[PDB]
Structure 1
Amino acid sequence: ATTFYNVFVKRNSAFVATILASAFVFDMTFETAIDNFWDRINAGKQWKDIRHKY
């Protein structure tokens, strides 16, 4: 906790760098997660689900 504080939080430059890097990760992973979840709740309905017939 001291270590974590000292590395990522104490210097604002480091805190902002950590926040921005986390936002980058969040953005990419959240995108993938929602895409999969959306495809499951709307299964068999979307073009991607019927495309194979054509």
Structure 2
Amino acid sequence: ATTFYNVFVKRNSAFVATILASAFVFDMTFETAIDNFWDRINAGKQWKDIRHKY
């Protein structure tokens, strides 16, 4: 907790760097997660689901 604070939080330069890197990771992972979820709730309905017929 001290260690974590000292490395990532104490210096604002490090805090902002950590926040931005997390935002990058979140953005990429959230994209992928929503894509999969959206495809499961709308299964068999989307073009990608019928495309194989044509």
Q: TM class by shorter-chain length?
A: over 0.9
Provide, for residues 2-54 of structure 1, a one-character-per-residue CA deviation record: whole Å limited to 9, x for no partner: 00000000000000000000000000000000000000000000000000000
Corresponding residue for 1:11? 11
* d(CA) in 2 for partners of 1:2, 1:10: 10
* d(CA) in 2 for partners of 1:24, 1:13: 17
* d(CA) in 1 for partners of 2:52, 2:15: 48
Aligned residues: 54
Q: TM-score, normalised by structure 1?
A: 1.00
After the TM superposition, which segments of 4 or more aligned residues of structure 1 sit over 4 Å from their partners? none
* d(CA) in 1 for partners of 2:52, 2:32: 23
Query: 5+ residue gaps in structure 2?
Result: none
Q: TM-score, normalised by structure 2?
A: 1.00
Identity %: 100
